[PDB]
């Protein structure tokens with residue numbers, strides 16, 4: 001007895017059915033089932049949700065009710081006893097650049113987003129939750145441990161609000177609570193253009209027929225464009241330095257300004273759209289604005305898909321790549337392209353790949369300025385360092401020259417994120433991303449670690465000795481058992497990230513399975529997949545294969561020296577070469593004659 005009635009809270013509209021361009025909402029990708037993969041709908045469930053009361057309450061909500069007979073440990077204790085570490089030396093990935101971490105975040109924001117719940121416009125819940133830590137409704141505070149240093153200095157808890165769900169959003173009940181995915185599931189560059197008709201429009205430059213995206217008018221970066229500033233005050237980007245008063249950037253995705261390197265990436269993409277746009281006009285002068293926008297937009301969509309599947313996943317999945325994502329075989333209308341709820345947690349392996357600092361390099365790739373190496377935490381929502389401290393070129397050079405942080409069982413998430421994370425809504429640099437993650441697993445009703453091992457057809461340890469063998473680490477297996485009392489209770493996020501990495505990969509067996517299935521699906525169930533005959537012509541595909549992130553760089557910055565394989569670790573100057581030597585995207589294949 002199914003129930004696929006519920007739904008209304010979703011911007012719907014008619015379909016075109018022979019239109020060459022994706023919709024902004026993702027609707028109409030699948031002809032037989034039009035809303036599949038669309039934005040503002042529930043994340044798919046690969047396994048039933050698991051809640052304390054079976055419907056909506058998270059485990060750890062009612063301190064008396066246990067999970068399989070035990071209390072589930074506070075997310076912060078787990079963070080404190082397993083995730084943290086003090087010594088940053090020797091933690092860098094010797095063969096993965098900072099861009100490896102950054103691209104990952106870009107693909108993830110393109111694929112999923114479960115925003116937190118409102119009712120908080122002119123609200124005291126917004127305060128009944130941070131001031132008094134009173135658990136209730138959408139307020140599910142992260143309590144502090146005994147002997148936590150934040151006690152003495154911050155309070156009794158860390159505010160936290162539950163994720164939005166479907167049908168309603170206020171006081172609801174009836175079916176199992178399913179979270180929302182506010183963005184399109186397809187890998188379509190929805191982070192550049194937006195996932196709603198409203199925002200998509202406001203991002204475009206409609207005062208002219210060039211099909212360009214709107215750009216900043218207050219500042220330019222050596223003639224090159226900037227994303228436009230965001231309208232909305234109070235702005236968090238101006239709170240971190242009230243004297244600079246530089247607001248956050250307005251982009252296709254709302255998280256664009258979490259960190260300076262994510263804003264740099266967004267800007268690089270924006271710039272490529274315009275470039276691509278003024279170039280296409282030049283070859284097809286008659287084309288109107290719409291045509292220029294959609295056509296460029298589609299090129300860029302094909303760009304992200306290529307870099308992701310050709311250069312990124314192969315070094316995440318490693319030797320497991322082929323076991324999950326076989327050679328492409330054409331569009332399969334039976335494949336469900338929805339992002340699963342658990343994927344949004346599996347893709348968080350990236351948080352353990354973020355180093356403690358971000359550097360800026362001058363033209364010889366040497367420290368730019370005296371205070372060239374900044375601590376990550378000073379850059380959450382920091383837009384002023386771009387506008388008033390050198391533009392994006394210095395940051396992009398750091399992306400190519402510095403390394404990512406290597407995931408390590410005894411050194412998982414840097415303190416820059418574990419103790420000094422900054423939230424919009426709040427006023428301090430004192431949050432814990434690791435604790436938030438674990439708290440979010442419960443909020444989302446995730447099955448335990450062993451449910452997912454079974455799902456992926458992997459052994460399921462029940463004993464300490466069993467876990468030691470799987471983690472291949474006596475001590476970690478030990479800390480994990482003392483806190484969870486059973487491997488069945490280990491949250492998927494930490495459980496999955498504690499496994500050793502597969503050959504040539506950066507994730508373990510469980511994650512490779514979870515990541516692998518998701519990408520196989522978004523590819524096979526995407527009617528607009530770039531390799532799908534009819535989407536692009538044979539001659540356009542031969543052109544799209546030469547796309548390189550190195551090139552993207554060359555055409556949108558004043559960097560003339562770039563690595564050929566920007567994801568592996570490269571040393572300047574030996575592994576860098578003049579832009580004049582890098583393949584360029586040939587657009588002549590897009591020229592459409594007449595008569």
Ligand code: HEM
Nearest residue numbers: 101104105108112113114259344347348350351354436440
């Ligand atoms: C600061 C943060 C980052 C780097 C300095 C960072 C980075 C990543 C990478 C590199 C990811 C994948 C390769 C990735 C995935 C996901 N993130 Fe994370 N991220 C930073 C900060 C945050 C915060 C805060 C959140 C929200 C947590 C919450 O539950 O409230 C966050 C989330 C996620 C996320 C879940 C997305 C969703 O579907 O709603 C990823 C898949 N990141 N990040």
Ligand SMILES: *[C@@H]1O[C@H](CO)[C@@H](O[C@@H]2O[C@H](CO)[C@@H](O[C@H]3O[C@H](CO)[C@@H](O)[C@H](O)[C@@H]3O)[C@H](O)[C@H]2NC(C)=O)[C@H](O)[C@H]1NC(C)=O
Nearest residue numbers: 094095096310311314315316318504505564565567568569
């Ligand atoms: C640092 O990481 C690099 C990438 O993981 C790695 O180099 C890669 O090694 C693989 C070995 O399989 C090779 O991959 C390509 O091999 C041929 C090209 O000759 C292609 O037809 C294949 O499809 C495949 O893409 C490459 O040699 C290289 N891959 C890339 C994309 O450059 C380095 O070995 C790592 N460094 C160390 C010290 O381990």
Ligand SMILES: *[C@@H]1O[C@H](CO)[C@@H](O[C@@H]2O[C@H](CO)[C@@H](O[C@H]3O[C@H](CO)[C@@H](O)[C@H](O)[C@@H]3O)[C@H](O)[C@H]2NC(C)=O)[C@H](O)[C@H]1NC(C)=O
Nearest residue numbers: 240241242243244245246369370371378384385387388389
């Ligand atoms: C808030 O943003 C301010 C910039 O808008 C920043 O100060 C700026 O940064 C330094 C001061 O440390 C100055 O630049 C340096 O270079 C000039 C070159 O002309 C030299 O004269 C000095 O050595 C100078 O330090 C900027 O001029 C300065 N701008 C202003 C208005 O002060 C603040 O440090 C930021 N505050 C925080 C807390 O981050």
Ligand SMILES: *[C@@H]1O[C@H](CO)[C@@H](O[C@@H]2O[C@H](CO)[C@@H](O)[C@H](O)[C@H]2NC(C)=O)[C@H](O)[C@H]1NC(C)=O
Nearest residue numbers: 204205206207208210212213214215216217228
């Ligand atoms: C929309 O596009 C127009 C045309 O490209 C932009 O107008 C130009 O702006 C730059 C710098 O201000 C200069 O070349 C001229 O002042 C304008 N040229 C023309 C032909 O108008 C305009 O800035 C864009 N609008 C937004 C909001 O980004």
Ligand SMILES: *[C@@H]1O[C@H](CO)[C@@H](O[C@@H]2O[C@H](CO)[C@@H](O)[C@H](O)[C@H]2NC(C)=O)[C@H](O)[C@H]1NC(C)=O
Nearest residue numbers: 328329330331332333334335336520521524525
């Ligand atoms: C299209 O995708 C479907 C759905 O994933 C594939 O279906 C599987 O095919 C086998 C063999 O026919 C069925 O017995 C299974 O029930 C399906 N598995 C699952 C998990 O649904 C199908 O193989 C794909 N077809 C093509 C031509 O690619």
Ligand SMILES: CC(=O)Oc1ccccc1C(=O)O
Nearest residue numbers: 254255256258380422423424
């Ligand atoms: C980065 C991520 O996914 O987070 C955010 C998005 C929008 C606004 C704030 C944040 C954050 O919590 O730092």
Ligand SMILES: [Ca+2]
Nearest residue numbers: 110184186190
């Ligand atoms: Ca998308």
